[PDB]
C-alpha cells in the first residue's frame, strides 16, 4: 500500500463517519506520530479556519487536494449551499480525497476536479458555470502559484474582494508569487506567520489525587 | 552567556512588562525557534492551566522552577489570596526565575525556595507555617518524584483532595512513580496524553485580496 492509502485506513479505523472534526484529529495524529505528510496541518489550519469564518465565501477554489485534509477543514465551515471546488492532478490522490470526503459526510459540498490547474482553470466558466470565485486556496506545486494567479486574472475569475490564501510562502517558499502580489496594486496583502506540522514526541502528565492514608 | 540568560534577555527584549501572557509567548517562540529548553511547554501547559482552573488551589508547591515558565503559567491563573511556592536547587536558575517573575509582574504571588526538595520539604511547616498543600507540580529530576511523594506524605503535607500533577511520566518517563500512584489506594489517577515541545520550522500563509486590474 501507499502512504495515502495508510492515512485513509487510519481515519476509517479511528474517526467517526459524518464527524469532520474527528477526521481532522485522526489525520493530525497519524501525520505527527506515524508518517509525515504534506497536509496544511493544524497550526496553519486554524488560520485557514479564521479566514473562512471571516469572509463566509459562497464559492471556494482549492488548488491541490492531496488526501482531502484542507478540503475537510474548509467544507466543514461553509454555510449551507456554499461550495468548494478542488483541483487535483494525481488521480490516486483524488481517489483518496473522494473517500475522505464521503467518510466525513461533506461530499455534497465539495466537487473534485480531476486534472491540472493549468488545464482546468480555463474550463471553469464554460464547463462548471462559474462566474467569479469568492476565495482561492493555493497549495499545489509552488512554482505554479504565480502562473495560476495570472491565469485566474486573465480568465476573469477574480473580482474585487476575492480572497487568495497561499500556503508555504516561506517554506518551501514562493518568492516570485510573494513579490508579485505584494508589489502589485491589484492585491492587498496580509501575512500570517505560523509553523509547519512536523513529527512529535508523545508525553503526558499524570494527575494523582490523594485520598488519605 | 548561558542559555537561560539568553532566554531571559529575549523575554525582556520582546515581551511586554507586566504581561504574563506575552512572557509565555516570548519563551515559547525562543525555545521552539532558537534553542530548545526543558520548559513544560505550551501543549502540556494548556493541560496545567485547565487543572489550575478546575481546582482553584490556594497553596501550590512546584518542584523544579528552571527559568520560571511554569511558575508564570500557574501564578497568572491563581485567585486573590492564593500563593505558589517553588523549589529550585540551582542558584543560577533560581535567580533567572526571580527576574522572570519580576518582569511578568507576578513576584507578589510566588516565593522561590533555593535548595533541594528533599531538604526543604520537611521544613515547610516550620519555616512557612504550611498546614497542607492544595496542589503539587512535580517537574524536577525524575528519580525524585516517588521519594518526594513519599516524603510529602510522611511530613503531613497532603490532605484528602490534594492534587499531584506530574510532568514527563512517559518521556523521559517516571515508571516507579507511576506504578506507585496508580497501584496505591491512596491516589486516584488520571492520565493526560500530550506532546513534548520540540523545535519547529516557521512557515506562513499570505492573504492577498484582489482589487481589480
Ligand atoms: C501539499 S499537497 C495538498 C495538501 C492539501 N491542500 C491539504 O492541505 O490537505 C500538493 C498537491 O497538489 C497537487 N498538484 C500539484 N500541482 C498541481 C496542478 N498544477 N494542478 C492540480 N494539482 C496539482 C499534487 O498532486 C498534490 O496533491
Ligand atoms: C524541567 S526543569 C523545570 C521546568 C519548569 N517546571 C517549567 O516548566 O518551566 C527541572 C529543574 O529542577 C531542578 N531540580 C532538580 N532536582 C531538584 C530537587 N531535588 N530540588 C529542587 N530542584 C531540583 C533543576 O535544577 C531544574 O531547574
Ligand atoms: O516539504 N514541505 O514541508 C511541504 C509542506 C507543504 O505544506 C507543502 O504544501 C509542500 N508541497 O506542496 O510540496 C511541501
Ligand atoms: O529531555 N526532555 O525532553 C525533558 C523534558 C522535560 O519536560 C523535562 O522536565 C526534562 N528534565 O527535567 O530533565 C527533560
Ligand atoms: Br502527478
Ligand atoms: Mg502546503
Ligand atoms: Mg518537564
Numbering used by the authors:
A (entry chain A), B (entry chain B): 46 to 258
From the paper:
One example where the lack of enzyme regioselectivity limits potential commercial productivity is the engineered biosynthesis of the flavor and fragrance agent vanillin 2 a.3 Catechol‐O‐methyltransferase (COMT) has been used to methylate 3,4‐dihydroxybenzaldehyde (DHBAL, 1 a) and 3,4‐dihydroxybenzoic acid (DHBA, 1 b) in engineered strains of Escherichia coli and fission yeast for the production of vanillin 2 a from glucose. However, the lack of regioselectivity of COMT results in a mixture of 2 a and the undesired para‐methylated isovanillin 3 a, which are difficult to separate. Structural and mechanistic information suggest that the regioselectivity of COMT can be attributed to the concerted action of a “hydrophobic wall” found in the active site of the enzyme, and the substrate properties. The orientation of the R group in the active site determines whether the meta‐ or para‐hydroxy group is methylated.
The Y200 mutants generally showed increased re values in favor of the meta product with all substrates, with Y200L exhibiting the greatest meta‐selectivity with 1 a–d whilst retaining relative activity similar to that of the WT with 1 a and 1 d. The X‐ray crystal structures of dimeric Y200L and WT COMT revealed that a key residue (E199) had been flipped out of the active site. We rationalize that in the WT monomeric enzyme, E199 can form a hydrogen bond with the aldehyde group of 1 a, thereby leading to some para‐methylation, whereas in dimeric Y200L and WT COMT the absence of E199 from the active site results in the aldehyde group orientating towards the solvent, thereby leading to meta‐methylation. In contrast, both oligomeric forms of Y200L showed high re values with 1 a (ca +90 %). However, the re value for Y200L monomer (ca. +90 %) suggests that in the absence of dimerization, the Y200L mutation alone is sufficient to cause loss of E199 interaction with the substrate. Since monomeric Y200L is as regioselective as the dimeric forms (ca. +90 % re), we suggest, based on the structural data for the Y200L and WT dimers and the regioselectivity assay data for both oligomeric forms, that loss of para‐methylation is largely due to movement of E199 out of the active site, as a consequence either of mutagenesis (Y200L) or protein dimerization and domain swapping (WT). Active‐site modifications thus appear to cause significant shifts in regioselectivity independently of the enzyme oligomeric state. Finally, we demonstrated potential applications for our improved COMT variants by regioselectively alkylating 1 a by using ethyl, allyl, and benzyl AdoMet analogues generated enzymatically or synthetically.11 Products 4 a–c were obtained with re values of approximately +90 % with Y200L compared to +33–45 % with WT COMT.
